[PDB]
Design an enzyme around this catalytic site. Structure first.
Site, PDB file in Angstrom:
ATOM      1  CD  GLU A   1      11.819  -7.962 -24.204  1.00  0.00           C
ATOM      2  OE1 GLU A   1      11.648  -7.750 -25.425  1.00  0.00           O
ATOM      3  OE2 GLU A   1      11.681  -9.100 -23.704  1.00  0.00           O
TER       4      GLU A   1
ATOM      5  CD  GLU B   1      12.772 -15.251 -25.987  1.00  0.00           C
ATOM      6  OE1 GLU B   1      12.138 -14.373 -26.616  1.00  0.00           O
ATOM      7  OE2 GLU B   1      13.345 -15.038 -24.891  1.00  0.00           O
TER       8      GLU B   1
END
Ligand SMILES: [Zn+2]
Length: 411
Positions: A219, A255
């Protein structure tokens, strides 16, 4: 020593590093007790019902791999444990050479002062600040880069989000914006070891658990992209060929890039170059803006000081005339660092822990954990403690052998 202060949830607010704060565009929310663990970085030990209006409830919907529990993180003791867990994962990350670099980049990644409609005027963008309530009741506006907060309704739905502007795309125009990471150090995911030719056979047994530090690092990598405003439009996806029973499974470039390793290569050379040239052009625009700036609003900080702050963030070049410009190789180094060096894959290698090999190796279960006690997890070894017998064959991450550190919850 990333967090140079022992923080206990129950410590009295002081208006400096422990305080009741108010988040932007939050409608009218009640203040929440927050902690400043490092320059530009705060933590709010609360379930996130502030960042999004449509998600201001911890009520279970019609469901869909998710986990719900409206009572989670509702007590002071839980918030204290949460605060300790987050803090500990930051130290674990900061202790590696890679993690020290990433956190340094994040701290230097001040969102750009591009909130002015007057091009000769530098101005902050309010949604990149928080209001820090003082002991006397007044509020001080403070700029920050990162906020770690608890998950919303879906407890294991972690993510990196930010407020965004009416017209500007802060996370994609090079400016950047304050990043809010929904995360919990109280849970982690289980994944099955993909039996390959050349993979260690002595591997304990069945399920292994993801080191929560890798999850947070993941993250924090998105956050770094977003702070430098070089995130890939979430619209850009790769149609992964999973089954023959599927005429399609989309995974975004953002991602694939963040996970790194073999999957990052699914972003072909044409696209890589495209993104790189685009952001390079965007950094040049930031340079121009800084050059045309003659005044600064919301005065306190001097103009040359703020200009220097951004000269440092973007590694800009400055000539004797005092004019800024973008150096091709400095840009390339910075950009490469943020997109290719900081990846989940490289973190797994530094930490020397077992982890899913690719997104393709989707996790199976959700486990409840507690990394706070040293008897369970340490900054230096994670679950694989030294003297312990857990420091062999990743026994510490083996949810069978180290059954005491993992409590199955779902799937
Ligand atoms: Zn991600």
């Amino acid at each position: 020593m990333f967090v140079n202060k022992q923080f206990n949830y129950k410590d009295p607010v002081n208006g400096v590093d422990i305080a009741y704060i108010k988040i932007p565009n939050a409608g009218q929310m009640q203040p929440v007790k927050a902690f400043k663990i490092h320059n530009k970085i705060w933590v709010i030990p609360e379930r996130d019902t502030f960042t999004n209006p449509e998600e201001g409830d911890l009520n279970p919907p019609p469901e869909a791999v998710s986990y719900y529990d409206s009572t989670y993180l509702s007590t002071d003791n839980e918030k204290d444990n949460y605060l300790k867990g987050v803090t500990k994962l930051f130290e674990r990350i900061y202790s590696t050479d890679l993690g020290r670099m990433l956190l340094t980049s994040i701290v230097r990644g001040i969102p750009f002062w591009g909130g002015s409609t007057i091009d000769t005027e530098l101005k902050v963008i309010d949604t990149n600040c928080i209001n820090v309530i003082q002991p006397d009741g007044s509020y001080r506006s403070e700029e920050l880069n990162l906020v770690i907060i608890g998950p919303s309704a879906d407890i294991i739905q972690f993510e990196c989000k930010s407020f965004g502007h009416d017209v500007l795309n802060l996370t994609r125009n090079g400016y950047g914006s304050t990043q809010y990471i929904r995360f919990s150090p109280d849970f982690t995911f289980g994944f099955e070891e993909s039996l390959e030719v050349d993979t260690n056979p002595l591997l304990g047994a069945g399920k292994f658990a993801t080191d929560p530090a890798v999850t947070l690092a993941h993250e924090l990598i998105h956050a770094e992209h977003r702070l430098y405003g070089i995130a890939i439009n979430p619209n850009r996806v790769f149609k992964v060929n999973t089954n023959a029973y599927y005429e399609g499974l989309e995974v975004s470039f953002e991602e694939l890039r963040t996970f790194g390793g073999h999957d990052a290569k699914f972003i072909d050379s044409l696209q890589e170059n495209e993104f790189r040239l685009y952001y390079y052009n965007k950094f040049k625009d930031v340079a121009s803006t800084l050059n045309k700036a003659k005044s600064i609003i919301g005065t306190t900080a001097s103009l040359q000081y703020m200009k220097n702050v951004f000269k440092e963030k973007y590694l800009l070049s400055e000539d004797t005339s005092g004019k800024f410009s973008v150096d091709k190789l400095k840009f390339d180094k910075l950009y490469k660092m943020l997109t290719e060096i900081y990846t989940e894959d490289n973190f797994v290698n530094f930490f020397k822990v077992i982890n899913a090999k690719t997104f393709l190796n989707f996790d199976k279960a959700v486990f409840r954990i507690n990394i706070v006690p040293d008897e369970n997890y340490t900054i230096k070894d994670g679950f694989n403690l030294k003297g312990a017998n857990l420091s062999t064959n990743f026994n510490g991450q083996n949810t069978e052998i180290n059954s005491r550190n993992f409590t199955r919850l779902k799937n």
